[PDB]
Design an enzyme around this catalytic site. Structure first.
Site, PDB file in Angstrom:
ATOM      1  N   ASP B  65       0.834  -1.193   0.000  1.00 43.38           N
ATOM      2  CA  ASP B  65       0.000   0.000   0.000  1.00 43.38           C
ATOM      3  C   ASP B  65       0.873   1.249   0.000  1.00 43.38           C
ATOM      4  O   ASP B  65       1.777   1.389   0.829  1.00 43.38           O
ATOM      5  CB  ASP B  65      -0.925  -0.005   1.218  1.00 43.38           C
ATOM      6  CG  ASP B  65      -1.932   1.134   1.200  1.00 43.38           C
ATOM      7  OD1 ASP B  65      -1.981   1.883   0.202  1.00 43.38           O
ATOM      8  OD2 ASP B  65      -2.676   1.278   2.191  1.00 43.38           O
ATOM      9  N   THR B  98      -4.812   4.390  -4.195  1.00 43.81           N
ATOM     10  CA  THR B  98      -3.844   5.135  -3.396  1.00 43.81           C
ATOM     11  C   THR B  98      -2.535   5.325  -4.151  1.00 43.81           C
ATOM     12  O   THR B  98      -1.977   6.429  -4.183  1.00 43.81           O
ATOM     13  CB  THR B  98      -3.600   4.423  -2.067  1.00 43.81           C
ATOM     14  OG1 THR B  98      -4.830   4.342  -1.334  1.00 43.81           O
ATOM     15  CG2 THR B  98      -2.574   5.179  -1.241  1.00 43.81           C
ATOM     16  N   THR B  99      -2.022   4.255  -4.761  1.00 43.07           N
ATOM     17  CA  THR B  99      -0.783   4.363  -5.523  1.00 43.07           C
ATOM     18  C   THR B  99      -0.982   5.170  -6.801  1.00 43.07           C
ATOM     19  O   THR B  99      -0.070   5.887  -7.230  1.00 43.07           O
ATOM     20  CB  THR B  99      -0.246   2.967  -5.846  1.00 43.07           C
ATOM     21  OG1 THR B  99      -0.005   2.254  -4.627  1.00 43.07           O
ATOM     22  CG2 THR B  99       1.055   3.054  -6.629  1.00 43.07           C
ATOM     23  N   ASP B 404      -7.992  -3.245   2.310  1.00 45.58           N
ATOM     24  CA  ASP B 404      -8.203  -2.569   1.035  1.00 45.58           C
ATOM     25  C   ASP B 404      -9.245  -3.285   0.186  1.00 45.58           C
ATOM     26  O   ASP B 404      -9.961  -2.640  -0.588  1.00 45.58           O
ATOM     27  CB  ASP B 404      -6.882  -2.457   0.272  1.00 45.58           C
ATOM     28  CG  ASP B 404      -5.919  -1.479   0.917  1.00 45.58           C
ATOM     29  OD1 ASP B 404      -6.364  -0.671   1.758  1.00 45.58           O
ATOM     30  OD2 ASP B 404      -4.717  -1.519   0.581  1.00 45.58           O
TER      31      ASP B 404
HETATM   32  N1  LIG Z   1      -5.266  -8.406 -12.345  1.00 48.59           N
HETATM   33  C1  LIG Z   1      -5.191  -7.199 -12.957  1.00 48.59           C
HETATM   34  N2  LIG Z   1      -5.126  -7.100 -14.302  1.00 48.59           N
HETATM   35  C2  LIG Z   1      -5.050  -5.906 -14.920  1.00 48.59           C
HETATM   36  N3  LIG Z   1      -5.032  -4.728 -14.269  1.00 48.59           N
HETATM   37  C3  LIG Z   1      -5.095  -4.679 -12.917  1.00 48.59           C
HETATM   38  C4  LIG Z   1      -5.177  -5.943 -12.170  1.00 48.59           C
HETATM   39  N4  LIG Z   1      -5.223  -5.615 -10.866  1.00 48.59           N
HETATM   40  C5  LIG Z   1      -5.173  -4.262 -10.783  1.00 48.59           C
HETATM   41  N5  LIG Z   1      -5.092  -3.703 -12.005  1.00 48.59           N
HETATM   42  C6  LIG Z   1      -5.026  -2.247 -12.285  1.00 48.59           C
HETATM   43  O1  LIG Z   1      -4.003  -1.639 -11.495  1.00 48.59           O
HETATM   44  C7  LIG Z   1      -4.460  -0.393 -10.961  1.00 48.59           C
HETATM   45  C8  LIG Z   1      -3.946  -0.216  -9.538  1.00 48.59           C
HETATM   46  O2  LIG Z   1      -4.295  -1.357  -8.757  1.00 48.59           O
HETATM   47  P1  LIG Z   1      -3.688  -1.587  -7.282  1.00 48.59           P
HETATM   48  O3  LIG Z   1      -2.193  -1.381  -7.328  1.00 48.59           O
HETATM   49  O4  LIG Z   1      -4.230  -2.901  -6.772  1.00 48.59           O
HETATM   50  O5  LIG Z   1      -4.344  -0.417  -6.389  1.00 48.59           O
HETATM   51  P2  LIG Z   1      -3.484   0.842  -5.867  1.00 48.59           P
HETATM   52  O6  LIG Z   1      -2.957   1.503  -7.117  1.00 48.59           O
HETATM   53  O7  LIG Z   1      -4.491   1.672  -5.107  1.00 48.59           O
HETATM   54  O8  LIG Z   1      -2.418   0.219  -4.996  1.00 48.59           O
HETATM   55  C9  LIG Z   1      -5.979  -0.412 -11.022  1.00 48.59           C
HETATM   56  O9  LIG Z   1      -6.463   0.801 -11.603  1.00 48.59           O
HETATM   57  C10 LIG Z   1      -6.344  -1.593 -11.901  1.00 48.59           C
HETATM   58  O10 LIG Z   1      -7.027  -1.137 -13.071  1.00 48.59           O
END
Ligand SMILES: Nc1ncnc2c1ncn2[C@@H]1O[C@H](COP(=O)(O)OP(=O)(O)O)[C@@H](O)[C@H]1O
Ligand SMILES: Nc1ncnc2c1ncn2[C@@H]1O[C@H](COP(=O)(O)OP(=O)(O)O)[C@@H](O)[C@H]1O
Ligand SMILES: [Mg+2]
Ligand SMILES: [Mg+2]
Lengths: 48, 550, 520
Positions: B65, B98-99, B404
């Site tokens: 996170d 968040t990221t 999350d």
């Molecule tokens: N299995 C997946 N396949 C393709 N895209 C993904 C997948 N999981 C997450 N994403 C993309 O990555 C982006 C960020 O996801 P994540 O890193 O889990 O949340 P955060 O950015 O808040 O840490 C999201 O906008 C999503 O569209």
């Protein structure tokens, strides 16, 4: 007379005017008191 | 990128640190922005990798996170605290993105700073971002997809797997998908006269390291972490309709109010006064035992004086627990939390309506830790999740990984409209803003064109962490999305494209609907609004003034 | 400068290389601690004591290792101990080799870690099925079968000479604590040790061993049928929560204050004499005035007792802890006490409480141990905790896994066969798991002094044709079968070794960068 209350978080677009007095302080809830009262008379206690 | 520092002028004097003005401030703002940005770039996406931070005491923290990573980083730069507090604002409100909001707001500052050197005024740059954002939100409403013709919970199962990706639970996301969906549906309540809301953190997270993470059991009810007061009490309650007593009153030898001073002229009164001190507490516990309460919960510690009657009556005693944990136990079992025991009449009494109801109350021992498992609640259902891992540091990551996932599913049932994830929206907002501003043109066309390319940092960063070719995937995302924007809503074909792309696992362009990756529309909105305010506040700063501490 | 950050930031592939090299050094220290011929490791604590043991759990616990990745390997020691208690050294050696054997790549192939993790999850699922197929169930009601099972963890320890005597102590301790499913816990098992003596003279005695002599010379040290009553309240005069502050107007009132203090304590002693207990145990201190009226009625007084010992006394004699003297009844008085005696030893006195042995609450028992010194006692105590923990797995899980390195080698053979059939991009991470499983039986050869090249080559060939029970002999360093070898190990120990090692390796592969000394 104008009172401007500040709350952390949110966006500027969420800023709006209220038609009544906004209470900055918050309730107790330690005893599980109702947080919503419809058609209630708000009192003022200067004693303890 | 700042060299030679700055020449201190004697005609300009101010108490404290020196005052730096000009392009040096905006160069240091981007330099401080890229410092916190490069930390969350490698942690973004399922192919991303998290980082480790040492606490100087030997303990570390492993989490994907971006909020926790930035929270552990104390930034001395004044403008750097905005992006740090932006992550704490992101997970508190929406709970997702968040990221992304840190990386989006970082590219907005890098491109706008290059535009300020182009001599266009920052307010014109800010005007270009706000006008383009107003139309970008309207495009998000056009791409909304309401769940229809779906079998069972598959809608929430596929969305929950998106948040589970990029984290240690991503490989186990197949098994953990059914645990998260069933956890928020059991805590379902009603408020605002018909509005459905869900509590946050209501699902208890217990940490017991052992066995495997795929064997984590989902308890059909709430679980409380506490140790039994007396080891002679039964750890398992047999039979249904178990009565639970939630009490804030401790049972202990207590001193009389400090405003009282006992003065006795006779030695004969020392026997009754000392005995009555323990006898006053007996009147409260006696009426509770006679009611048939099997389990008695207490917010404060209980001395061994009153724990004797619990053993003879086969009543299980409880000691200090979190105050917010005992509220959901009484609500689920039907009990009423009593802060102080009293009745409307001036005489003490105990009513059977203050006792809860459930199927059974058992104490299970996970590894060397013992916790109480309350299953089959009566009034309202509940749930709990016991996370299992190799070490306690992995359990600390699985907690934030589970927290999350609860926020993404929470925002899913509030608004039925969802949008496809995996860089599909960021690639769709690029072309939509490319044709935009072409009608207005003039000076504002340059500031808006850079805002469209600023959203391209999210899909391009995902391909870098996968050790693949980014230019091959980005050129495809621009190929399918661009040609389909002018489509007319008949003869079909056309818009069937542009709704999918950027699959990091296989490196190919596949449909996100069949893949299952989806994101709530709430996570997309308010993310660019918060990133805009972080960009506007930093861009408007011409001069930074530092005052030396006293 | 900016925030708290930078210095030298390790980025790229060298950050994962430092995580593999540091974690590999953890298993290299206890690498000689595996096997029946395993050596010992002497540890020096900052407190000034000494810890000498071959158990990787106690070795990695006291050693202070400063490193972000290497400390994660230290946490795996308590994962095996708290959940099971046996196999702590195997997990660290296995998890240390998995990280090195399963991920030499990304230094060469540049394979993404998550791609490897996806293969580790499928390799863990197939590894559990292989262990279930090679596991033959064993009867838990056979005393002769449980003795050879406890000797499994004993064969690698120093108590193997007393193993014939040690299995008598471990079997009776687990069977007594077992309550009828069949859930037992070591919180009621007493680790108390006796300095000096002969190991053969040590025996498990029912009851609680107290270090305190009788308070008064007229207290009987020999009782045929002791009756024990537990009191949490002190026999002294309770001052109270609030100050009394007696105002004495007349000279006759002050003498009555001191006179009631004698009668008030006497009133609490008369209520005790209603059940005429032979032995009275008080958790707190006792006054010298209260012991006289208890001695007149036959009650025995003892020193203040800790809360931990009060729970074990109530289980042996069936007594119920009674705080309020006025509420004391004959139903809460403990009975069926075999013998009460006190033996003289130069260090301290010792009080014995024997059980009449004749469903109800689980019985409590203490384990007496006679060593050659104080540190030898601590080594056997760690050996008993490892030996008695084996009997807990067979009762809850009757399945019995192959020992002597046959479990890890049987999985490595099945993973190599499915590696060619899987193909795909995951074949390299999946096949590399089998190379890390054969390192545990390879350590048995290096400690025995044999040639691991020729022995492991014939071990894999004889595994398919001969049987799944073929393994490495510890003493002779030869190829033998676990059927004729006579020693087996529960499946729970092998399942925790495979799960904990693989789940921990996935955590270190996800590390990108490392920043030290951020803040507190
Ligand atoms: N299995 C997946 N396949 C393709 N895209 C993904 C997948 N999981 C997450 N994403 C993309 O990555 C982006 C960020 O996801 P994540 O890193 O889990 O949340 P955060 O950015 O808040 O840490 C999201 O906008 C999503 O569209
Ligand atoms: N006498 C023996 N001969 C061959 N292998 C043995 C022998 N004793 C133990 N082993 C192997 O060593 C491994 C660990 O056993 P042990 O040393 O008792 O536990 P730990 O390694 O935790 O001290 C087991 O998996 C077993 O296969
Ligand atoms: Mg996420
Ligand atoms: Mg062992």
């Amino acid at each position: 007379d104008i009172r401007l209350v500040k709350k952390v978080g949110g966006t500027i677009d969420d800023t709006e005017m209220i038609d009544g007095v906004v209470l900055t302080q918050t309730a107790i809830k330690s005893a599980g008191g109702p947080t919503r009262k419809e058609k209630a008379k708000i009192g003022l206690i200067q004693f303890q | 990128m700042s060299q030679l520092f700055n020449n201190s002028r004697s005609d300009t004097l101010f108490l404290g640190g020196e005052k730096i003005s000009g392009d040096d401030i905006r160069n240091q703002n981007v330099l401080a922005t890229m410092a916190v940005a490069n930390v969350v770039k490698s942690s973004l996406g399922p192919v991303g990798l998290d980082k480790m931070l040492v606490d100087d005491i030997g303990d570390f923290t492993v989490t994907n996170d971006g909020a926790t990573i930035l929270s552990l980083l104390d930034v001395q730069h004044p403008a750097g605290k905005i992006l740090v507090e932006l992550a704490q604002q992101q997970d508190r409100e929406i709970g997702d993105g968040t990221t992304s909001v840190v990386i989006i707001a970082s590219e907005l500052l890098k491109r706008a700073n290059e535009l300020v050197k182009n001599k266009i005024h920052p307010t014109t740059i800010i005007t270009g971002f706000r006008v383009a954002l107003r139309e970008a939100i309207r495009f998000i409403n056009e791409v909304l997809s309401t769940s229809v013709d779906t079998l069972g919970k598959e809608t929430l199962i596929n969305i929950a797997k998106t948040s589970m990706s990029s984290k240690i639970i991503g490989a186990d996301s197949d098994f953990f998908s059914n645990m998260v969906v069933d956890a928020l549906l059991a805590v379902k309540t009603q408020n605002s006269k018909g509005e459905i809301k869900y509590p946050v953190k209501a699902v208890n997270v217990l940490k017991a390291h052992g066995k495997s993470a795929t064997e984590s059991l989902l308890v059909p009810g709430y679980a409380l972490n506490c140790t039994v007061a007396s080891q002679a009490m039964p750890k398992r309650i047999a039979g249904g309709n178990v009565k639970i007593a939630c009490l804030d009153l401790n049972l202990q030898k207590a001193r009389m109010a400090m405003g009282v001073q006992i003065n006795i002229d006779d030695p004969e009164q020392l026997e009754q006064i000392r005995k009555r001190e323990a006898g006053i507490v007996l009147e409260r516990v006696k009426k509770i035992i006679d009611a048939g309460a099997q389990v008695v919960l207490t917010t404060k510690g209980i001395d061994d004086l009153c724990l004797k009657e619990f053993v003879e009556a086969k009543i299980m005693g409880v000691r200090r627990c979190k105050k917010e944990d005992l509220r959901r136990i009484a609500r689920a079992t039907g009990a009423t939390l009593v802060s102080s025991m009293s009745n409307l009449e001036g005489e003490e009494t105990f009513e059977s309506s203050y006792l809860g109801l459930c199927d059974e109350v058992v104490q299970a021992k996970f590894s060397d830790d013992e916790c109480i498992l309350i299953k089959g609640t009566s009034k309202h259902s509940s749930s709990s999740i016991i996370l299992r891992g190799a070490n306690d540091y992995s359990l600390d990551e699985m907690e934030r990984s589970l927290h999350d996932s609860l926020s993404v599913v929470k925002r899913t049932l509030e608004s039925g409209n969802v949008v496809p994830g995996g860089g599909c929206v960021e690639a769709a907002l690029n072309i939509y803003l490319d044709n935009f501003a072409t009608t207005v043109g003039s000076r504002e066309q340059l500031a808006i064109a850079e805002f469209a390319a600023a959203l391209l940092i999210i899909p391009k960063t995902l391909a870098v962490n996968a050790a693949k070719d980014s230019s091959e995937l980005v050129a495809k995302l621009r190929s399918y999305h661009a040609a389909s924007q002018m489509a007319k809503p008949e003869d079909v074909k056309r818009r069937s494209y542009r709704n999918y792309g950027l699959d990091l696992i296989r490196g190919k362009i596949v449909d996100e609907i069949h893949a299952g990756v989806l994101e709530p529309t709430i996570s997309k909105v308010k993310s660019l609004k918060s990133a805009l305010e972080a960009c506007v506040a930093i861009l408007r700063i011409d001069t930074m003034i530092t005052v030396d501490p006293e | 400068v900016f925030m708290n950050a930078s210095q030298e930031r390790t980025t790229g592939r060298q950050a994962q290389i430092s995580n593999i090299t540091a974690a590999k050094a953890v298993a290299d220290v206890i690498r000689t601690c595996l096997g029946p011929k395993a050596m010992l490791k002497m540890l020096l604590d900052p407190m000034g004591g000494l810890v000498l043991t071959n158990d990787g759990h106690a070795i990695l616990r006291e050693i202070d290792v400063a490193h972000p990745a290497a400390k994660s390997m230290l946490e795996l020691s308590r994962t095996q101990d708290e959940e099971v208690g046996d196999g702590t050294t195997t997990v660290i050696i296995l998890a240390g080799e998995i990280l090195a054997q399963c991920a030499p790549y990304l230094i060469e192939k540049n394979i993404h870690p998550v791609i490897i993790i996806q293969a580790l999850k499928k390799a863990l699922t197939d590894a559990l099925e292989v262990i279930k197929q090679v596991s033959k169930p064993v009867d838990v009601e056979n005393d002769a079968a449980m003795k050879k099972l406890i000797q499994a963890s004993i064969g690698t320890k120093y108590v193997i000479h007393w193993s014939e005597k040690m299995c008598e102590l471990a079997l009776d301790a687990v069977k007594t604590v077992r309550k009828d499913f069949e859930i037992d816990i070591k919180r009621y098992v007493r680790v108390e040790k006796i300095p000096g003596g002969d190991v053969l003279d040590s025996r498990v005695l029912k009851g609680v061993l107290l270090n305190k002599d009788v308070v008064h010379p007229k207290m009987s040290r020999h009782i045929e049928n002791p009756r024990v009553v537990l009191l949490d309240c002190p026999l002294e005069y309770k001052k109270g929560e609030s100050q009394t502050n007696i105002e004495i107007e007349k000279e006759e009132d002050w003498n009555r204050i001191l006179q009631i203090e004698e009668e008030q304590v006497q009133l609490m002693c008369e209520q005790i004499l209603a059940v005429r207990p032979t032995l009275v145990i008080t958790e707190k201190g006792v006054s010298d005035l209260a012991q006289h009226y208890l001695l007149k009625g036959g009650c025995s007084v003892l020193r203040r007792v800790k809360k931990s010992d009060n729970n074990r006394i109530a289980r042996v004699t069936g007594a119920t802890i009674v705080n309020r003297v006025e509420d004391l009844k004959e139903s809460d008085v403990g009975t069926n006490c075999g013998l009460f005696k006190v033996e003289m030893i130069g260090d301290e006195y010792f009080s014995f409480l024997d059980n009449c042995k004749e469903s109800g609450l689980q019985k409590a028992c203490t384990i007496m141990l006679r060593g050659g010194s104080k540190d030898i006692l601590n080594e056997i105590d760690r050996n008993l905790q490892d030996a008695m923990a084996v009997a807990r797995n067979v009762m809850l899980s009757p399945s019995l896994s192959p020992g002597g390195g046959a479990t890890e080698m049987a999985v490595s053979v099945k993973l190599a066969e499915k590696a060619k059939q899987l193909e795909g991009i995951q074949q390299w991470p999946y096949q590399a798991v089998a190379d890390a499983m054969e390192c545990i039986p390879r350590t048995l050869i290096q400690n025995a002094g044999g040639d691991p090249i020729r022995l492991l080559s014939q071990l894999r060939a004889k595994h398919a044709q001969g049987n799944f029970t073929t393994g490495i002999d510890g003493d002779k360093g030869k190829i033998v079968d676990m059927v004729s070898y006579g020693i087996w190990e529960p499946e729970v120990i092998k399942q925790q070794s495979v799960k904990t090692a693989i789940e921990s390796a996935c955590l270190l592969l996800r590390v990108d960068d490392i920043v030290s000394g951020v803040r507190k």
